[PDB]
Design a protein around this ligand. Structure first.
Ligand SMILES: *[C@H]1C=C(C(=O)O)C[C@@H](O)[C@@H]1O
Ligand SMILES: *[C@H]1C=C(C(=O)O)C[C@@H](O)[C@@H]1O
Ligand SMILES: [Cl-]
Ligand SMILES: [Cl-]
Lengths: 236, 236
């Protein structure tokens, strides 16, 4: 039941060459993730334009739009206020199925619940996400983070962490697995880098709902092509 | 550094057709495991004859001979006395590189140390093995079993256990991983069945030294072809 996400990161012009590679991989892709943080001064209208090119394929996959802030390992240098206005305004593009919203311990909980409630009222599935690109907290802290993110009643919680050792990979898998056993909410757990690759291929074994791959070059530490990732998912 | 084992289980006649399939897979196979417990009243001289056919390939892989008792999930119904005489007598076949000897909590420790010391004096590498085909003990018990088997100073310790859930798979990986961090001894940890398949493909990720696959049909619960298993090992 694990769905394969293809992450793309184009500029305001989605190339015909990229549309072509998406189509060659159509049977591997359940979710197409349009990263937009790589577009300096991206607007909602530019996102709407790019989605017009993708929606022809809307029958073959769900569309997820993700603005990854620089603080959380992406390229987005929007202010928190401009970022949260972008997330809220993405509710109006009909073609979007899913929206990523970032979680960290210092957020305004009230504002986050307002935006999340708004996205869901506009029939958008919310992925609440947390990335640590430096380290992997101990097991009890990983479970704590999943627990705090699920309190917003999102469709998905996503935790991505950087292992320094084997135990860090096992702690991410164990946290995801325990969460998946106890909660209705869908869970996504990533151990990044080649060391954590087993979290991407065996995601379904440990109760996770999405696994992220690329079409060309790795879009995050440890990513492989979605054709190869679908083949991996199929093995487990 | 994880070595791929190809398990074969022939009758006194090793078929030319089997020798052919071994040769097609020569680049995937580091260790050829000749199971012999499927041969009722197998003798050391019959093993010696079969090894004559295999030793032409001795440059391309190590030869491991394994008598798996019925109590430990194999077909061998030799008495403990006849089984331990077979293990000791395998020391005299020059072509054998490795010998599997079974461990369980009720063994005569003195006799086991004598045989293990004899095999090693005859320049055989010892794999001390324990199989539980019904269940997976809790983490502290898994570590206990590895700890008791390593006290014999074997070349390898091998624990194969049957998971009932995700936590059982994670406990096998964690036990193997902790053992590999603290001991010089090589370690092999198998979670059997499709649920435990990640233990076979990601064995090297968690500090394990061997991973077992087949040439045709699965020879143990969860096994895949050694070509596909080598490809998996190569990914991690
Ligand atoms: C979340 C996680 C990713 C990953 O680790 O592969 C890729 C990124 O684009 C997603 O937003
Ligand atoms: C030990 C383990 C095996 C496995 O689980 O694949 C196969 C068996 O032949 C080995 O002795
Ligand atoms: Cl699809
Ligand atoms: Cl070889």
């Amino acid at each position: 039941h694990v769905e394969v996400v293809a992450t793309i990161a184009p500029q305001l012009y989605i190339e015909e060459t990229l549309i072509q590679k998406i189509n060659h991989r159509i049977d591997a892709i359940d979710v197409l993730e349009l990263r937009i943080d790589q577009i300096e001064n991206v607007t909602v209208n530019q996102v709407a334009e790019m989605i017009t090119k993708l929606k022809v394929m809307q029958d073959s996959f769900k569309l997820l739009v993700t603005y990854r802030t620089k603080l959380q390992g992406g390229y987005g240098q929007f202010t928190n206020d401009l970022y949260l206005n972008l997330i809220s305004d993405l509710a109006n593009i009909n073609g979007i199925d899913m929206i990523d919203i970032e979680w960290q311990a210092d957020i305004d909980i009230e504002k986050h619940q307002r935006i999340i409630t708004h996205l869901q009222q506009y029939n958008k599935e919310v992925v609440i996400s947390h990335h640590n690109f430096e380290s992997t907290p101990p097991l009890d802290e990983l479970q704590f983070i999943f627990f705090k993110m699920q309190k917003f009643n999102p469709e998905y919680v996503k935790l991505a962490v950087m292992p320094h050792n084997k135990n860090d990979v096992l702690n991410l898998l164990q946290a995801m697995s325990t969460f998946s056993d106890t909660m209705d909410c869908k869970v996504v757990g990533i151990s990044m880098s080649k060391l954590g690759l087993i979290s991407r291929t065996a995601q379904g074994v440990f109760g996770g709902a999405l696994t992220y791959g690329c079409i060309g070059e790795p879009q995050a530490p440890g990513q492989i092509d979605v054709t190869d990732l679908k083949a991996q998912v199929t093995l487990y």
